[PDB]
């Protein structure tokens, strides 16, 4: 129905990403609730509860049952435009929707850039250390 790139805008798509989520019924951070808050499930070997906002790309692990996903998103990523969107998807105008996807596109590039920064800073540490060791003896 809708192109892959845009599916994450849809709650039902997002819920579907929670294949093996530990926190189910009786918990505040259920998949319905995670999804309503913008989260997609991104589990790794090392962090099997890893969740990402599809819009601002904030990544959060270490979920506890009483965690309210909206308050966690508000806390950890206060500026995420998705938290401002009060209307339901069908009720958005295409202009509104296209505006949001532009912003998401920027958010993605901002994030890729922040990542590359951290990777570069980490290589710089390694190189600095190597040179010290070499200068020492």
């Amino acid at each position: 129905t809708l192109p892959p790139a845009w599916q994450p805008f849809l709650k039902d798509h997002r819920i579907s990403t929670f294949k093996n989520w530990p926190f189910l019924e009786g918990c505040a951070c259920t998949p319905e609730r995670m999804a309503e808050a913008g989260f997609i499930h991104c589990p790794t070997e090392n962090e099997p509860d890893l969740a990402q906002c599809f819009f601002c790309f904030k990544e959060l692990e270490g979920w506890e049952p009483d965690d309210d996903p909206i308050e966690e998103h508000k806390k950890h990523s206060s500026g995420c435009a998705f938290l401002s969107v009060k209307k339901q998807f069908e009720e958005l105008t295409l202009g509104e929707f296209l505006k949001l996807d532009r912003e998401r596109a920027k958010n993605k590039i901002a994030k890729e850039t922040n990542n590359k920064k951290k990777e570069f800073e980490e290589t710089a540490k390694k190189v600095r250390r190597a040179i010290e060791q070499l200068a020492a003896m």
């Binding site: 890893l50 969740a51 990544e59 959060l60 979920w63 506890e64 966690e72 950890h76």
Partner: peptide, 6 residues
């Protein structure tokens, strides 16, 4: 919860 590390 909290911010992914590493």
């Amino acid at each position: 919860a909290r911010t992914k590390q590493t």
